[PDB]
Amino acid sequence: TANREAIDMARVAAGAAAAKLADDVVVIDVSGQLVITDCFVIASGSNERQVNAIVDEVEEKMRQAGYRPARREGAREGRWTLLDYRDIVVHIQHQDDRNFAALDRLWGDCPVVPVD
Amino acid sequence: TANREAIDMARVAAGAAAAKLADDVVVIDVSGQLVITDCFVIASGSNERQVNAIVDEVEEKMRQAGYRPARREGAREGRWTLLDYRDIVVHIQHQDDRNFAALDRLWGDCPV
Numbered sequence: 001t002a003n004r005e006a007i008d009m010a011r012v013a014a015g016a017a018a019a020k021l022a023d024d025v026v027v028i029d030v031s032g033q034l035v036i037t038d039c040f041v042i043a044s045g046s047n048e049r050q051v052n053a054i055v056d057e058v059e060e061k062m063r064q065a066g067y068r069p070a071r072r073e074g075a076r077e078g079r080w081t082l083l084d085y086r087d088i089v090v091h092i093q094h095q096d097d098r099n100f101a102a103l104d105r106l107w108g109d110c111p112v113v114p115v116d
Numbered sequence: 117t118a119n120r121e122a123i124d125m126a127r128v129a130a131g132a133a134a135a136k137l138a139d140d141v142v143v144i145d146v147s148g149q150l151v152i153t154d155c156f157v158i159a160s161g162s163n164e165r166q167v168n169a170i171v172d173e174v175e176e177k178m179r180q181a182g183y184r185p186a187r188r189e190g191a192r193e194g195r196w197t198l199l200d201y202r203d204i205v206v207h208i209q210h211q212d213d214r215n216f217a218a219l220d221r222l223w224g225d226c227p228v
């Protein structure tokens with residue numbers, strides 16, 4: 001399964017998104033699929049303000065956890081942001097833009113990490 | 117349009133993939149679309165071991181040209197490997213998995 005250190009990072013990220021009332025907050029164990037990243041963290045906002053508040057909360061809480069800033073990515077015209085912390089990767093998106101079948105297609109065979 | 121520092125990185129990464137006999141090597145300018153990444157370099161290997169060697173070639177010359185180490189990722193079965201250099205992302209894939217349709221609906225308007 002996923003390394004304990006990676007799960008702890010995921011816990012911090014998911015707790016930050018939950019603190020800003022994100023929807024779809026799930027930690028995916030991708031340790032059996034990928035060679036580097038162990039946890040994928042999904043989160044969604046109902047508006048773009050919230051999406052960005054979730055993004056900033058995750059970064060601020062990850063900094064407090066002692067980690068270096070994520071390598072970031074997003075679409076200039078899109079409403080998503082990708083945060084790469086290596087052991088984990090965080091993906092935050094406006095719920096209206098999400099493709100949920102595509103998510104399940106990609107990670108449907110991966111265990112959910114009950115992180116609470 | 118795409119960065120000088122990125123084009124000269126894509127040049128190196130694509131040439132390296134060329135030196136180790138990759139197929140369907142493409143440099144895609146995504147600078148118009150993305151915030152951070154400026155270019156993608158996609159390539160195919162005929163098999164998992166060729167994908168492995170292609171990655172080696174790319175990483176070897178990128179280090180030689182004094183570039184930052186890649187943030188790597190890969191499928192555990194070696195079907196694909198990705199190297200993130202920030203300014204460019206290199207995507208090497210087993211030709212059987214290369215979906216050119218999905219590429220088109222997504223980086224089709226980008227110069228290639």
Ligand SMILES: [Mg+2]
Nearest residue numbers: 031035036038
């Ligand atoms: Mg792992």
Ligand SMILES: [Mg+2]
Nearest residue numbers: 147151152154
């Ligand atoms: Mg750019």
Ligand SMILES: [Mg+2]
Nearest residue numbers: 168169171172
């Ligand atoms: Mg190697």
